[PDB]
């Protein structure tokens, strides 16, 4: 069976609020490396903001530094994002994406469908 990756932890927070979003790769774990997460915001191309080695090395996308932590757990195929001081700015489609290779840029060969975060404004 191809990996396949389906995204969890998707839905409506309150601005302020924290989120973790998590993805299992189904297969064979040899069969990927780097994993990242991509937001779409409506209007908006799929913007990566997070992506891990195999090892753990991270990467984060400007506007959300020091607010998302990208982590794994290879013992159960699982890359994560936790997603703090969330702003109605971070509302969006969130897909996890793999690479058969250790980049943190590409090439993105696997997919998940994605899925959506809402966050709403205290105002």
């Known amino acids: 069976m191809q990996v396949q990756l389906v995204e969890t932890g998707g839905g409506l927070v309150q601005a302020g609020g924290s989120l973790r979003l998590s993805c299992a790769a189904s297969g064979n774990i040899n069969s990927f490396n780097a994993m990242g997460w991509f937001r779409q915001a409506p209007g908006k191309q799929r913007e990566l903001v997070a992506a891990?080695?195999?090892?753990?090395?991270?990467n984060y996308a400007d506007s959300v530094k020091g607010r998302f932590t990208i982590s794994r757990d290879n013992t159960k195929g699982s890359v994560y994002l936790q997603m703090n001081s969330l702003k109605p700015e971070d509302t969006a489609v969130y897909y996890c994406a793999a690479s058969e290779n250790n980049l943190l840029t590409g090439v993105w060969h696997y997919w998940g469908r994605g899925t959506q975060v809402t966050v709403s404004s205290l105002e």
């Open positions: 891990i080695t195999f090892g753990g090395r991270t």
